[PDB]
Design a protein around this ligand. Structure first.
Ligand SMILES: [Zn+2]
Ligand SMILES: [Zn+2]
Ligand SMILES: [Zn+2]
Ligand SMILES: [Zn+2]
Ligand SMILES: [Zn+2]
Lengths: 292, 355, 417, 21
């Protein structure tokens, strides 16, 4: 039908990749993933002649517009391959090596925040840019190494929700590929379900070629005539603000609107300092009255 | 010489948006749009006629209001022939009011208005409304006068006493009684009696009315509210729903009394408790966490970068179009500035910059 | 007024009115009270907003308007009378209402009466038409001319009231009671006819002024300050909003219900940069077709599972007998009504609610037994061919109902036992 | 009480009357 603007974000982080390859033994698994993605973009740009690809990597200290080159020469890959495929693959391996050399250079400073949401947002802006230019299908791909330490997704939660709402406005499914020890990533699974995206987690770096060639090929040209393969289901619930556990039925602030599994101490808001009404909370604490 | 006029127009525009505040703004809303369908809106003076464009704009208003603020109920009462006619009860489903408005499409606007009757029955409809819900009414009006059965000032006093606000979007020009309504209801403010100048201005006004409004410190109602996240099932068998009493393949299940429903964000029909998703409550967080404006750096001074930080394009070169996020110390293009300030609700420069 | 819960429950006539308006409300109410014998107050206790909405819809009335001005004379004339406008004329003109009520129920017909009315000079006088002796009018209607005149005098007497001196032109012209000047111009004074009498334009102007006064006193019905009046707001301070800003303190609890080292990650990082600059082969990515076959098995299993999920993507089409379908829908509906009322009683939480809770518990038990007996009926009507589907269709409401019964029993054992 | 009973019985007649209609 139409050229599908391909959006691929690769979450590269040595804190995750070192953790994964030390947990297992597949050194160069990230290289295997990169080669698989090279074949994936080849298969995509051979599926359609103009389904343009946006490739962005988010490193530890920030993000990088990988494909294409900025608005401001060895060849590792073979010379017998296709021209456009070769150009893209050579450009990406050059950009990848430059980013990895940079990452080796500035390895020793510490930044504990994931940049996945910012990378996703910048990619969505570029999707707006491409779609506003000249009619193009929007499909967003994330590659993550989930074997790293799940430190704090709490500050990541809000912009991820904002990105979900934006992609909902933009009809862009958010398809998730996870490689890690943890089977489940709740926010990503919710993201896939809300955006009609595809969630998938495995561990072995082998066979990802067949995995994301078979499953991860759904385009908006043929989305309604393809069943989604996701098996997990999400309650769309959140952990409590002061106890950190998910709540089924509970309480939220009339002002801050944060989930309270229990009564806040001092009857004041733990988010926006609103003192509440004692008769209201006593009625909430009321037991039912039962006949003797 | 058009760029100088554009620059001074942008300056006079930005003088209004210089002050950005984190006011407490209402989330549990209660919005009523009454419609007059009288002889005045039969004028074809604006193309095709006032009735058609207010129908179309009300369709858009319903969509935008339910998208941005799904945590409110919407009621519509039409005004026709000296009678105000309820056509839409307050409900969580926008589609009901969409169908009612589609009925309003084919019928013929005629008669004379009565804001007394309209606001009185709007008050009565707004009577069984809980405390946290912010009762507010949008009123469209095309007449310069109002035939009424009795006094309007008693109604004004009662509405002020019952803590309901109004906002009037008049068509032709200012009407002094509507100015009086807006001022007295709105604590002396004059920022509620608005008159369009063309249909584009009407569109902008409707978009402005979409937004939540700030609340007053003296009007203090700070409390909690009971809430319950339900669970969705996907069953093989069709099952009877509680609401519409008919067989449903899927449906959410009640967290408290374990009944099933058909739509969300809705309250329970059985345990009678509100059921939402965390997406719905986080939907207004941009209102809860506003975004600072981005400043163009001057063309005379030295520049940190010469191409856009976010969209990655070259900055064009008389003046300098480098809108800087002072919170992240990065300059951006106008397109990215627009997108981050309106569509997006986060600054990726501030996402990359660690705190 | 007619706005309390007691008033809305009391208005049995209005209750019957919207009953007769709906049809599913006869169905529901008949099953609720005619069939199940529920207290109809508690029936209407849920539908209180609907009752008030119906009342307020029925309760409004229009404002006054110049109905005679909207009357047009329209060869021949054909009467095209509107009853609402006839009553509007009656309300606006009690003289015309009286002339109707003493003549039509006594002497002649309504359309004949209105033809005589339109013929009458009293109609012209009450409208914006100068009376003329060339017009003959209607004698029967024009007998009321002096009655309307003394009505006008009495109404003007009622309309008289004292005036504020701030705007009192009578005080303004009574500034100097000994003004001795010259007689003013005939041009600017109220002109008269040849024989000194007036034409009566002053009469018609004071009449329309009386109409205006009557309209504004109809507004002014049952349903010092000059300090505020002379305020010059243009030189005053602008109003500023007292809206409260909100901050947000941020301290979230961690999610509740081995550590890597810089040396080791640096060693691996050095090694993997060595591998990166060393080599990269696209051709080695091809799998071993056996672990790949297990991947095929996993993928196809996921496809089968989610396809069976998608296989069950007006209500659904069903092969039920239509009567039994209606009966089971009805039973589901009344069970839902019972359950909602029982929850209303339970979540209320009073000792006054106790007998209500007990009785609704009995009703829920009765509904359970009736569901079981219905299951026996579809049992011996189908041989469980689709009586299984009947049981499964009525299952979840039964599960919720019996869960509520268990909750009631548990709280009974909590409090009493 | 007793005077409420004829009111419901009046509603009983009206419910039966609307049934045939
Ligand atoms: Zn709060
Ligand atoms: Zn339903
Ligand atoms: Zn419930
Ligand atoms: Zn830009
Ligand atoms: Zn920033």
């Amino acid at each position: 039908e139409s050229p599908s603007l391909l959006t691929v974000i690769i979450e590269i982080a040595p804190k995750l990749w070192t953790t994964f390859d030390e947990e297992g033994n597949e050194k160069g698994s990230i290289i295997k993933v990169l080669e698989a993605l090279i074949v994936f973009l080849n298969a995509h740009l051979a599926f359609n002649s103009a389904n343009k690809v946006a490739v962005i990597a988010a490193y530890s200290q920030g993000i990088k517009y990988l494909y294409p080159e900025s608005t401001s020469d060895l060849k590792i890959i073979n010379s017998d391959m296709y021209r456009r495929f070769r150009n893209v693959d050579e450009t990406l391996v050059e950009e990848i090596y430059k980013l990895f050399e940079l990452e080796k250079k500035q390895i020793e400073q510490n930044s504990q925040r994931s940049t996945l949401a910012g990378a996703m947002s910048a990619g969505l802006t570029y999707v707006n840019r491409i779609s506003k230019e000249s009619s193009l299908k929007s499909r967003l791909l994330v590659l993550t190494c989930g074997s790293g330490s799940s430190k704090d997704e709490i500050f990541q939660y809000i912009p991820i929700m904002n990105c979900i709402f934006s992609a909902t406005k933009m009809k862009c499914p958010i398809d998730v590929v996870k490689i890690g020890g943890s089977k489940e990533s709740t926010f990503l699974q919710q993201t896939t379900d809300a955006t009609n995206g595809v969630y998938l987690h495995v561990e072995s770096t082998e066979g990802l070629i067949q995995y994301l060639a078979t499953a991860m090929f759904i385009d908006p040209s043929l989305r309604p005539i393809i069943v989604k393969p996701n098996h997990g289901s999400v309650d769309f619930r959140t952990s409590c603000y002061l106890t950190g556990r998910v709540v089924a039925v509970g309480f939220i602030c009339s002002v801050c609107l944060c989930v309270l599994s229990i009564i806040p101490p001092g009857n004041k808001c733990p988010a926006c300092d609103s003192q509440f009404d004692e008769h209201v909370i006593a009625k909430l604490k009321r037991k039912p009255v039962v006949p003797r | 010489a058009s760029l100088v006029a554009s620059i001074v127009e942008a300056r006079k525009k930005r003088t209004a948006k210089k002050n950005i505040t984190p006011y407490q703004r209402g989330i549990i809303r209660s919005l009523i749009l009454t419609l007059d369908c009288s002889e005045a809106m039969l004028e074809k003076d604006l193309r095709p006629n006032r009735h058609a464009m207010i129908i179309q704009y009300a369709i858009d208003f319903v969509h935008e209001f339910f998208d941005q603020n799904p945590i409110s109920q919407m009621g519509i009462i039409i005004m026709r022939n000296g009678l105000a006619q309820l056509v839409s009860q307050v409900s969580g489903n926008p589609q009901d009011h969409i169908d009612a408005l589609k009925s309003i499409r084919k019928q013929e606007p005629k008669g004379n208005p009565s804001l007394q009757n309209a606001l009185e029955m709007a008050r009565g409809l707004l009577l069984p409304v809980p405390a946290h819900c912010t009762r507010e009414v949008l009123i469209v009006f095309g007449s310069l006068s109002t035939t009424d059965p009795g006094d309007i000032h008693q109604t004004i006093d009662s509405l002020v006493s019952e803590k309901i606000r109004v906002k009037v979007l008049g068509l032709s020009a200012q009407v002094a009684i509507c100015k009086e309504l807006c001022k007295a209801t709105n604590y002396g403010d004059e920022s509620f009696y608005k008159i369009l100048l063309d249909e584009t201005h009407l569109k902008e006004l409707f978009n402005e009315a979409v937004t939540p409004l700030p609340v007053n410190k003296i009007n203090k109602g700070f409390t909690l509210v009971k809430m319950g996240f339900p669970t969705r099932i996907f069953e093989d068998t069709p099952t009877f729903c509680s609401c519409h009493s008919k067989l449903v393949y899927g449906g959410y299940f009640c967290p408290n009394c374990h009944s099933k429903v058909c739509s969300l964000p809705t309250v329970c029909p059985c345990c009678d408790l509100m059921l939402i998703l965390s997406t719905h409550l986080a939907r207004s967080y941009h209102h809860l966490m506003p975004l600072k404006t981005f400043a163009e750096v001057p063309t005379t001074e030295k520049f940190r970068s010469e191409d856009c930080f976010s969209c990655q394009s070259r900055f064009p070169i008389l003046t300098s179009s480098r809108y800087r996020c002072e919170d992240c110390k990065q300059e951006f293009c106008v397109d990215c500035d627009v997108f981050i300030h309106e569509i997006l609700h986060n600054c990726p420069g501030c996402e990359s910059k660690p705190v | 007024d007619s706005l309390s819960k007691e008033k809305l429950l009391t208005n049995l006539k209005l209750q019957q009115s919207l009953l007769k308006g709906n049809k599913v409300l006869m169905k529901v109410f008949q099953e609720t009270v005619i069939n199940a014998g529920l207290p109809p107050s508690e029936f209407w206790s849920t539908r209180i907003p609907l009752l008030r909405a119906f009342a307020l819809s029925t309760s409004q009335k229009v404002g006054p308007y110049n109905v005679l001005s909207t009357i047009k004379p329209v060869n021949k004339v054909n009467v095209n009378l509107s009853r609402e406008k006839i009553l509007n004329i009656f309300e606006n003109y009690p003289i015309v209402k009286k002339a109707y009520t003493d003549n039509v129920p006594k002497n002649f017909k309504e359309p004949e009466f209105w033809a005589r009315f339109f013929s009458s000079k009293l109609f012209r006088k009450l409208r914006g038409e100068k009376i003329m002796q060339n017009d003959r009018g209607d004698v029967i209607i024009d007998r009321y001319l002096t009655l309307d005149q003394e009505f006008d005098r009495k109404d003007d007497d009622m309309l008289l009231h004292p005036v504020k001196k701030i705007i009192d032109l009578d005080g303004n012209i009574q500034d100097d009671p000994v003004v001795r000047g010259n007689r003013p111009d005939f041009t600017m004074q109220p002109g008269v006819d040849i024989n000194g009498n007036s034409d009566g334009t002053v009469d018609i102007l004071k009449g329309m002024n009386r109409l205006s006064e009557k309209m504004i006193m109809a507004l002014k019905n049952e349903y010092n300050d000059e300090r505020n009046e002379l305020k010059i707001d243009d030189l005053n301070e602008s109003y500023k909003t007292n809206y409260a800003i909100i901050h947000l303190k941020r301290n979230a609890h961690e999610k509740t219900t081995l550590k890597v080292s810089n040396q080791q990650m640096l060693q691996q990082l050095s090694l993997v940069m060595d591998n990166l600059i060393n080599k990269l082969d696209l051709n080695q990515v091809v799998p071993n077709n056996e672990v790949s076959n297990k991947i095929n098995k996993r993928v196809i299993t996921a496809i089968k599972i989610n396809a069976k999920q998608a296989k069950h993507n007006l209500e659904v089409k069903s092969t039920l007998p239509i009567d039994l379908l209606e009966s089971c829908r009805m039973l589901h509906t009344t069970c839902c009504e019972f359950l909602k009322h029982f929850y209303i009683h339970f979540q209320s939480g009073e000792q006054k609610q106790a007998s209500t809770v007990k009785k609704l518990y009995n009703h829920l038990k009765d509904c359970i037994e009736k569901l079981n007996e219905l299951f026996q009926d579809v049992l011996n009507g189908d041989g469980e061919s689709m009586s299984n589907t009947c049981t499964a269709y009525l299952k979840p409401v039964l599960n919720s109902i019996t869960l509520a019964t268990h909750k009631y029993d548990e709280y009974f054992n909590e409090y009493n036992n | 009480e007793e005077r409420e009973n004829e009111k419901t019985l009046n509603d009983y007649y009206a419910a039966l009357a609307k049934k045939q209609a």
